[PDB]
Amino acid sequence: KDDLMEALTEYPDAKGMLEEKGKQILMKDGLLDINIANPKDLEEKVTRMESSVDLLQTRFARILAEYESMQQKLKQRLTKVEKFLKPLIDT
Amino acid sequence: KDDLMEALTEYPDAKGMLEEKGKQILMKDGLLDINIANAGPKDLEEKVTRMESSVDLLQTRFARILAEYESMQQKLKQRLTKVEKFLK
Amino acid sequence: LLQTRFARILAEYESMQQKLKQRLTKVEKFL
Amino acid sequence: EIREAFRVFDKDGNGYISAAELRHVMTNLGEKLTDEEVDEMIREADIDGDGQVNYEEFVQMMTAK
Amino acid sequence: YLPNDYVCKKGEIGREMYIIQAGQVQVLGGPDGKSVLVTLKAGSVFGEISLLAVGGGNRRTANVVAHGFTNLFILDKKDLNEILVHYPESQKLLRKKARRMLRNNNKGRGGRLALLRARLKELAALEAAARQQQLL
């Protein structure tokens, strides 16, 4: 089987024709197991997951920047309050 | 061909030079190596793998950011409690 | 799931920031 | 981007950003409004006059052309 | 290697890693070349920094010439890659060492900061335009 696959690596449509006529041969007597056994949706979902991840990261970057700015402002206010209280604490 | 690509693993610029020279040769003589065939399932698989890697990286970054935010909030709460205790 | 977690974390961070800002404003008004 | 900017500037998450909180929105955001200028910007954006900029007020200020 | 044989040439890929087991080799440097800077003897390795490099990224620095009949032990980078395929816990350490050596020469948080800065610049352009419109 491996030799057949690796010889078919250089032949793209030969494998398709071979499998089509193998399906035909099976259909001649005992057609496969499920006749409704019959791709792009998987690739579309794979791409949509990456797009959603990228959008979430883009939103989270701005969210983190805003949170950092707010934390800096709050830290500055707390430091000012602590410095104001410092005169009473040391004295 | 495998030998040629094995000899080009250490010369990435030479690979591009060879491909460009071949493309100009084909354009000069041949079917001009028609560029309307494609631009970029292998591509879909590569895009899916890149999206999965980006999702994993984003999840790790989100976890790190959440841990850092929790640590910062705990430190701020401790500082506020200490300031209140010092005032009181 | 990541989007839902991000939304929940944003809401929790907003609530915590509101509590901290209220406490800081009360402290500043007192002093 | 408007919601993210409002959340970053409005660290309180209560739908209103005060004049002081605008300082926390200074580094997070890309606008210059602090001290007397911050108070003037709040008055211009705060049509109601309560001293704080709401989500609707912030959206109107951002989309005001 | 025969006497006066260029083991390593200047401006070459230098992918391998040679060790000396019998003989001596000399690094031909100097102002205009053809000048010995240092000679290594049995038990000395050189070129190991290239084993952690990438395709065509380790252009040799100088010339190395065998003084006489030298006996070297070559270990090619391709063999190292094949061996590394089966060892990820050593591969991560080797890549960390390579990253350290590449970082010590030049000098998601960053991307998020860049996106936030771009959004802030876009908002600031609009704020300046609104201020001008209020003035005008």
Curated annotation (Swiss-Prot), chain A:
Superkingdom of this protein's organism: Eukaryota
Localisation: Cell membrane
Expressed in which tissues: Expressed in the retina, in rod cells (at protein level).
Signal peptide: none
Residues forming coiled coils: 42-85
Record function comment: Pore-forming subunit of the rod cyclic nucleotide-gated channel. Mediates rod photoresponses at dim light converting transient changes in intracellular cGMP levels into electrical signals. In the dark, cGMP levels are high and keep the channel open enabling a steady inward current carried by Na(+) and Ca(2+) ions that leads to membrane depolarization and neurotransmitter release from synaptic terminals.
Assigned protein family: Belongs to the cyclic nucleotide-gated cation channel (TC 1.A.1.5) family. CNGA1 subfamily.
UniProt comment concerning the protein's domains: The C-terminal coiled-coil domain mediates homotrimerization of CNGA subunits.
Subunit (UniProt): Forms a heterotetramer with CNGB1 in a 3:1 ratio. May also form cyclic nucleotide-activated homotetrameric channels, that are efficiently activated by saturating cGMP, but poorly activated by saturating cAMP compared to the heterotetramer with CNGB1. The channel binds Ca(2+)-bound CALM1 via CaM1 and CaM2 regions of the CNGB1 subunit; this interaction modulates the affinity of the channel for cNMPs in response to intracellular Ca(2+) levels.
Protein name: Cyclic nucleotide-gated channel alpha-1
UniProt organism field: Bos taurus
From Swiss-Prot, chain C:
Residues forming coiled coils: 1-31
Localisation: Cell membrane
Annotated tissue distribution: Expressed in the retina, in rod cells (at protein level).
Domain of life where this protein originates: Eukaryota
Oligomeric form and interacting partners: Forms a heterotetramer with CNGB1 in a 3:1 ratio. May also form cyclic nucleotide-activated homotetrameric channels, that are efficiently activated by saturating cGMP, but poorly activated by saturating cAMP compared to the heterotetramer with CNGB1. The channel binds Ca(2+)-bound CALM1 via CaM1 and CaM2 regions of the CNGB1 subunit; this interaction modulates the affinity of the channel for cNMPs in response to intracellular Ca(2+) levels.
Domain notes: The C-terminal coiled-coil domain mediates homotrimerization of CNGA subunits. The cyclic nucleotide-binding domain (CNBD) comprises three helices and a beta-roll of eight beta-strands from CNGA1 and CNGB1 subunits. Upon cNMP binding transmits the conformational changes to the C-linker domain of the S6 helix to open the ion conduction pathway.
Family: Belongs to the cyclic nucleotide-gated cation channel (TC 1.A.1.5) family. CNGA1 subfamily.
Function summary: Pore-forming subunit of the rod cyclic nucleotide-gated channel. Mediates rod photoresponses at dim light converting transient changes in intracellular cGMP levels into electrical signals. In the dark, cGMP levels are high and keep the channel open enabling a steady inward current carried by Na(+) and Ca(2+) ions that leads to membrane depolarization and neurotransmitter release from synaptic terminals.
The name this protein goes by in its record: Cyclic nucleotide-gated channel alpha-1
Organism for this UniProt entry: Bos taurus (Bovine)
Encoding gene per record: CNGA1
UniProtKB/Swiss-Prot annotation, chain E:
Record comment regarding domains: The cyclic nucleotide-binding domain (CNBD) comprises three helices and a beta-roll of eight beta-strands from CNGA1 and CNGB1 subunits. Upon cNMP binding transmits the conformational changes to the C-linker domain of the S6 helix to open the ion conduction pathway. The ion conduction pathway consists of S5, S6 and pore helices from CNGA1 and CNGB1 subunits. It contains a central hydrophobic gate that opens upon cNMP binding. CNGB1 displays an additional charged arginine gate below the central gate to regulate ion permeation.
Protein's UniProt name: Cyclic nucleotide-gated channel beta-1
Entry comment describing in which tissues the protein is expressed: Retina, testis, kidney, heart and brain.
Signal sequence coordinates: none
Binding site for 3',5'-cyclic GMP: G47, E48, S50, R60, T61
Superkingdom of the organism of origin: Eukaryota
Residues annotated as binding 3',5'-cyclic AMP: R60
Region of interest (Calmodulin-binding CaM2), residue spans: 132-136
Region (Cyclic nucleotide-binding domain) residue spans: 1-102
Compartment(s): Membrane
Role description: Pore-forming subunit of the rod cyclic nucleotide-gated channel. Mediates rod photoresponses at dim light converting transient changes in intracellular cGMP levels into electrical signals. In the dark, cGMP levels are high and keep the channel open enabling a steady inward current carried by Na(+) and Ca(2+) ions that leads to membrane depolarization and neurotransmitter release from synaptic terminals.
Entry similarity comment: Belongs to the cyclic nucleotide-gated cation channel (TC 1.A.1.5) family. CNGB1 subfamily.
Subunit structure, interactors included: The rod cyclic nucleotide-gated channel is a heterotetramer composed of CNGA1 and CNGB1 subunits with 3:1 stoichiometry. CNGA1:CNGB1 channel binds Ca(2+)-bound CALM1 via CaM1 and CaM2 regions of the CNGB1 subunit; this interaction modulates the affinity of the channel for cNMPs in response to intracellular Ca(2+) levels. The olfactory cyclic nucleotide-gated channel is a heterotetramer composed of CNGA2, CNGA4 and CNGB1 subunits with 2:1:1 stoichiometry.
Gene for this chain: CNGB1
Organism: Bos taurus
